[PDB]
Design a protein around this ligand. Structure first.
Ligand SMILES: CC(C)=CCC/C(C)=C/CC/C(C)=C/CONC(=O)CP(=O)(O)O
Ligand SMILES: OC[C@H]1O[C@@](CO)(O[C@H]2O[C@H](CO)[C@@H](O)[C@H](O)[C@H]2O)[C@@H](O)[C@@H]1O
Ligand SMILES: [Zn+2]
Lengths: 410, 315, 11
């Protein structure tokens, strides 16, 4: 073996150079862009190697913490474009802090609860800010944020009776859901609805009638899932689709074989990170949307009695993903990002960290196997693959709400 | 009338025609979180938007105000919803609104609200005449814009405009054969017109795809389409394909070709093929080659496939 | 932070 102060990396092996793009001497916009990213990434990788000396990689926890702590209270006008997504900012930041095991002061927690209460609509659901119409995306974010806080104060903010009525007000006869009244339809809505309904215990027999079938129609020839039937497979929509089906216990409605082959193919042989769709670029946020699909598929196949499943690893290159996130997605000033050259933002900070946690932790049944690349302190808290909040938070919230009746239903 | 960046722009709090209504500030609570330090202009427009919304004022001034609110944050879906309420209530010229959304999407093509607004207008007018050309212009700037392709599929299916889409697909594939959004549109068009059961159509597609593969052997999209149009009937149902790929292996031993062979072997074993032991041995050898040398990023997947094959066909 | 230019909007 090697001394504790040097840790060989997959991305630094001499044979890794063979993984560079082969454009077959036929250049198109796609290959040109891919080659540009690979050139930059190789430069980054090389900066972490000093011949046979390869220092352990470090997650800059403290820098990330200070960036997050500041954002939770105030934001520059650069975030005016997210004025209709305030609950998302709460969730992204709180989940990042949770992954980093950084305590949330009680005062700050109460202030977040009060703010989300102001975003809650009298018709049920939460809007992007005080007085805004409710929308399933901020509703999903608000519920997740309240569950991360996990106090009875936070749980009780949610008006469950109106929330269920609101979900009914968005339900379509073909099984799909509108994102908001008079709004668009895509797989994101099914997941947002399934996530908040299961956590708050408001699922009725008919709420999701036809939903599983509609989601299956979104799986396409590629194996992944598109936003609506007929559309290109995309990691974001595929995560939403599979996670929703897992909540509904209808994963078998999909061709899991083609889905598995599709997502594993989305990990970039050279960069180590994941792309959102075939022939597009690597991006740190897909560390969650794409890689998060492996724990879901593992669970789904394990429920089916698959005798070939691993008892120690997810079906993606866990080490290579950690290498991509740690070497290429950290902003030296704190925060994480899409790829070198891009600026940090709270959204990428949330998902790059969520993906890193998934890559470090394997769990199935009574089996637990951790693979924490770099210094030991890099280990993050685990995240639930369905909800993307701590597993402890999921259990605590589900248990709390299971003690309440389904609004006006028996 | 006057844009937010125009030299003569005046804050709403200073407009005489707006003096009769009090602005409604946003209440973020006494101890704010994720508080955005808005510019004076941003806050001014939204304080008045909140006022007209709270009063549910269906007026021409409210309608013009939404235009500025949208310029400040086109992702504010509440503003868009209210603007649509006003369009109906004021009986606004929808063709003029179409010219408006056209300009807005050109500026912010990756926004969900703008594409949905356009769809609603097209639905209200039952007029798709400008759609294919407009979308084509958006795709000329970003050939992979997801929202544009989604809107394009909706228009084509809702108004049955299939006649020239395969020709459009062919042109875009000529420009960039690696454009996965275009291969997806190819499947979309064929499955919804002739279908793939017509053996003449299937042969044409398999031939076309194989030609693209020979031209650009490492383009994953073509390989994925080839598998996509053959997978449901079963890859083992096409014996000649195996031979052709086997002949191209010695000169094009790419991970895509090797993986495709494993996929064929998997299906063959699932269908009581002849020489089962030999096929299983060949598949396991390729899984090892993929895991250790040719496609190591997917070592865990290939090892799983190897174990899976043994659990299903060892005997 | 440049969330305005990022193509990663989920809403
Ligand atoms: C729970 C939610 C709201 C999940 C959605 C997650 C994602 C990531 C959705 C993506 C939607 C999408 C495909 C938008 C189109 O614009 N984005 C891109 O083009 C990014 P890329 O190039 O990586 O495909
Ligand atoms: O990944 C293919 C797999 O998806 C399903 C849906 O679960 O069908 C999709 O793909 C077909 C092409 O293989 C399309 O005809 C169909 O429209 C699309 O939904 C499964 O039937 C298939 O095995
Ligand atoms: Zn991203």
């Amino acid at each position: 073996s090697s001394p504790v102060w040097s840790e060989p990396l997959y991305s630094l092996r001499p044979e890794h150079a063979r993984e560079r793009l082969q454009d077959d001497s036929v250049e198109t916009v796609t290959s040109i862009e891919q080659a540009k990213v690979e050139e930059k990434i190789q430069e980054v990788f090389s900066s972490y190697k000093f011949n046979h000396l390869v220092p352990r990689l470090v997650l800059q926890r403290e820098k990330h913490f200070h960036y997050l702590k500041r954002g939770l209270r105030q934001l520059t006008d650069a975030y005016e474009c997210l004025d209709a997504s305030r609950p998302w900012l709460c969730y992204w930041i709180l989940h990042s802090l949770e992954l980093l095991d950084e305590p949330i002061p009680q005062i700050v927690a109460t202030d977040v609860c009060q703010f989300l209460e102001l975003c809650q609509s009298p018709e049920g659901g939460f809007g992007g800010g005080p007085g805004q119409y409710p929308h399933l995306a901020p509703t999903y974010a608000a519920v997740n944020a309240l569950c991360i806080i996990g106090t009875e104060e936070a749980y009780d903010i949610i008006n469950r009776e109106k929330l269920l009525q609101y979900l009914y007000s968005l339900k379509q006869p073909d099984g799909s859901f509108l994102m908001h009244v008079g709004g668009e339809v895509d797989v994101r809505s099914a997941y947002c609805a399934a996530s908040v309904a299961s956590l708050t215990n408001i699922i009725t027999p008919d709420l999701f009638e036809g939903t599983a079938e509609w989601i299956a129609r979104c799986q396409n020839w590629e194996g992944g899932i598109g936003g609506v039937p007929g559309m290109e497979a995309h990691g974001g929509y595929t995560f939403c689709g599979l996670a929703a089906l897992v909540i509904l216990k209808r994963e078998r409605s999909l061709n899991l074989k083609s889905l598995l082959q599709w997502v594993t193919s989305r990990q970039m042989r050279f960069e180590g990170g994941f792309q959102g769709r075939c022939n597009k670029l690597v991006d740190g946020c897909y560390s969650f949307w794409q890689a998060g699909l492996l724990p879901l598929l593992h669970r789904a196949l394990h429920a089916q009695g698959d005798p070939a499943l691993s008892m120690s690893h997810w079906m993606f290159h866990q080490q290579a993903l950690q290498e991509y996130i740690l070497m290429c997605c950290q902003c030296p000033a704190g925060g994480l990002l899409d790829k070198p050259g891009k600026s940090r933002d709270f959204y990428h900070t949330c998902y790059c960290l969520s993906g890193l946690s998934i890559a470090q932790h394997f769990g199935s049944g009574a089996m637990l196997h951790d693979v924490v690349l770099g210094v030991p302190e890099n280990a993050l808290q685990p995240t639930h693959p369905v909800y993307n909040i701590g597993p402890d938070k999921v259990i605590q919230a589900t248990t709390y709400f299971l003690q309440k009746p389904v609004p006006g239903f028996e | 009338f006057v844009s937010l960046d125009s030299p003569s722009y005046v804050l709403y709090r200073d407009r005489a025609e707006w003096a009769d209504i009090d602005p409604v500030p946003q209440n973020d609570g006494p101890n704010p979180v994720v508080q955005i330090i808005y510019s004076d202009k941003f806050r001014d427009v939204y304080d008045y938007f909140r006022a007209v919304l709270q009063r549910d004022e269906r007026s021409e001034r409210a309608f013009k105000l939404t235009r500025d609110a949208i310029e400040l944050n086109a992702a504010n879906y509440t503003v868009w919803h209210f603007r649509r309420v006003l369009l109906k209530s004021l009986q606004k010229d929808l063709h003029e609104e179409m010219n408006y959304i056209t300009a807005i999407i050109e500026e912010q093509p990756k926004n969900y609200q703008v594409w949905h607004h356009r769809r609603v207008l097209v639905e209200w007018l039952r007029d798709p005449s400008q759609e294919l050309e407009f979308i084509a212009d958006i795709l000329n700037q970003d050939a992979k814009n997801y929202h544009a392709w989604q809107h394009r599929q909706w228009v084509i299916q809702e108004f049955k405009l299939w006649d020239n889409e395969l020709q459009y697909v062919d042109q875009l594939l000529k420009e960039d054969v690696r454009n996965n959004s275009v291969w997806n549109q190819r499947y979309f068009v064929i499955s919804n017109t002739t279908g793939y059961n017509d053996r003449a159509v299937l042969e044409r597609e398999v031939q076309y795809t194989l030609e693209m593969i020979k031209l650009v052997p490492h383009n994953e999209s073509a390989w994925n389409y080839l598998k996509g149009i053959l997978q449901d009937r079963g890859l083992s149902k096409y014996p000649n394909l195996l031979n052709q790929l086997l002949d191209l292996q010695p000169s094009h031993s790419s991970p895509y070709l090797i993986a495709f062979l494993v996929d064929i072997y998997e299906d063959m074993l699932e269908n009581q093929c002849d020489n089962k032991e030999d096929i299983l041995n060949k598949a396991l050898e390729l899984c090892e080659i993929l895991a250790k040398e040719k496609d190591t990023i997917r070592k865990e997947y290939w090892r799983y496939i190897g174990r899976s094959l043994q659990s299903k066909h060892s005997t | 932070d440049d969330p305005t230019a990022s193509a990663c909007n989920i809403q």
